[PDB]
Amino acid sequence: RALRVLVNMDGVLADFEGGFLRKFRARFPDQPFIALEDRRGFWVSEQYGRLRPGLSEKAISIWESKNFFFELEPLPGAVEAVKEMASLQNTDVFICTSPIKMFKYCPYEKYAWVEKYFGPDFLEQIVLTRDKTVVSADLLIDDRPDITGAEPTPSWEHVLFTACHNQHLQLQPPRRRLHSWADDWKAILDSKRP
Amino acid sequence: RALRVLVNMDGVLADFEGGFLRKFRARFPDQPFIALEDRRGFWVSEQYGRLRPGLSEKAISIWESKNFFFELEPLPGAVEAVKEMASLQNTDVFICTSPIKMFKYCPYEKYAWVEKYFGPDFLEQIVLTRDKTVVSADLLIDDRPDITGAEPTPSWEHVLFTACHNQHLQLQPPRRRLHSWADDWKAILDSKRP
Ligand SMILES: Cc1cn([C@H]2C[C@H](OP(=O)(O)O)[C@@H](CO)O2)c(=O)[nH]c1=O
Ligand SMILES: Cc1cn([C@H]2C[C@H](OP(=O)(O)O)[C@@H](CO)O2)c(=O)[nH]c1=O
Numbered sequence: 001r002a003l004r005v006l007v008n009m010d011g012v013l014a015d016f017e018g019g020f021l022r023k024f025r026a027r028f029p030d031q032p033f034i035a036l037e038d039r040r041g042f043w044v045s046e047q048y049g050r051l052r053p054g055l056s057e058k059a060i061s062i063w064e065s066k067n068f069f070f071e072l073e074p075l076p077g078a079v080e081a082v083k084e085m086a087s088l089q090n091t092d093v094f095i096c097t098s099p100i101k102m103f104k105y106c107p108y109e110k111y112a113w114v115e116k117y118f119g120p121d122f123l124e125q126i127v128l129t130r131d132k133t134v135v136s137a138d139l140l141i142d143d144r145p146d147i148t149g150a151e152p153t154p155s156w157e158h159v160l161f162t163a164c165h166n167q168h169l170q171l172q173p174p175r176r177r178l179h180s181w182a183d184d185w186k187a188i189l190d191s192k193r194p
Numbered sequence: 195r196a197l198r199v200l201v202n203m204d205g206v207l208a209d210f211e212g213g214f215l216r217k218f219r220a221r222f223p224d225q226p227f228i229a230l231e232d233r234r235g236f237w238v239s240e241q242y243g244r245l246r247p248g249l250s251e252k253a254i255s256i257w258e259s260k261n262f263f264f265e266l267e268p269l270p271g272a273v274e275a276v277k278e279m280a281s282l283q284n285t286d287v288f289i290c291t292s293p294i295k296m297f298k299y300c301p302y303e304k305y306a307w308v309e310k311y312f313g314p315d316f317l318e319q320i321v322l323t324r325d326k327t328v329v330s331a332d333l334l335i336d337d338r339p340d341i342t343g344a345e346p347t348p349s350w351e352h353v354l355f356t357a358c359h360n361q362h363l364q365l366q367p368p369r370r371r372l373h374s375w376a377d378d379w380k381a382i383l384d385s386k387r388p
């Protein structure tokens with residue numbers, strides 16, 4: 001009876017693209033880079049690899065480094081919106097996020113980041129998983145276009161959160177976007193209420 | 195169409211009770227302890243607290259310490275059974291586990307432990323969550339008696355994995371047990387197949 005909304009972390013709450021670019025340029029100042037306006041495709045490393053050999057690996061080294069995830073800036077309006085959303089009657093919010101493959105820092109720092117911006121109690125709302133299709137909900141707000149896994153018919157509707165890497169993408173008609181946290185997320189939630 | 199089984203970690207794959215007792219006695223040799231045969235109730239700290247003041251906090255300090263989760267021994271038959279289970283046709287296995295509240299080590303070490311016993315590829319199967327009711331599956335094999343959360347009608351059947359803390363518990367009749375990994379887990383899976 002409560003509406004259940006999964007909110008993705010990187011690309012939705014936390015500015016992974018901006019953080020990556022800043023730290024990449026700082027560490028590899030003699031290398032070429034991709035301006036955010038020129039990003040295409042979800043995987044940063046794939047575009048960097050196309051741009052010259054060995055650059056994929058240098059890109060990966062940025063997000064595998066300590067404090068990369070912890071130091072990400074929140075996207076504008078994201079913390080306020082999620083706080084408001086969680087406080088709504090008949091509304092349960094989980095943060096549903098995937099770790100990178102190297103697990104030394106990323107799990108820990110994602111929990112740390114949520115504590116920082118949402119408080120200790122909000123840690124109870126974190127679902128860390130590589131497969132979001134096995135998490136049941138009414139809505140998943142996520143910047144990644146292709147959300148696949150072991151469940152062929154997830155219970156949620158995937159609402160595509162706009163990011164630099166996806167802003168030009170034409171989606172299969174029934175599919176919907178949340179263009180930013182200034183956009184009308186309440187109306188999206190309301191369209192799903194019983 | 196594939197059967198989906200969530201397998202819990204502590205108390206099912208990893209021997210949290212035995213590990214705790216060993217390290218508690220080593221660190222607090224002048225304190226009284228609870229032999230595994232005398233354990234009752236899921237929460238170790240609650241029973242320790244009843245046994246004398248301040249002992250709850252000393253207990254908690256054991257599992258909050260570095261390497262506690264990483265150094266847990268697998269339960270007999272657990273690694274072999276899960277490997278066999280995951281290899282079965284039409285059978286998807288996820289490891290569904292909750293972190294403790296202090297997140298400095300536990301997330302990381304649980305991933306590390308799964309890598310150690312199941313290999314890098316099995317990391318894709320981990321779901322870290324405080325709420326298992328929002329994870330959809332056919333079966334949840336879990337030593338904790340009370341599995342609650344935001345979903346009042348989970349999709350899985352909870353099969354109670356026997357542990358020292360629950361072995362005397364009378365369950366509400368429809369509820370089922372897996373008494374150990376030597377017990378016939380294949381038959382349990384089969385009862386759920388379409
Ligand atoms: C490699 C890579 C990871 N990520 C993020 C997304 C996942 O986090 P999240 O699920 O919070 O969006 C995590 C693992 O892929 O890292 C990107 O956002 N872009 C990338 O290019
Ligand atoms: C405090 C406590 C935690 N745990 C485990 C269970 C959870 O792991 P798991 O979900 O893998 O069983 C984790 C957080 O409570 O620590 C016990 O098994 N016994 C306890 O007394």
Ligand SMILES: [Mg+2]
Nearest residue numbers: 008010011143
């Ligand atoms: Mg994302």
Ligand SMILES: [Mg+2]
Nearest residue numbers: 202204205337
């Ligand atoms: Mg357990």
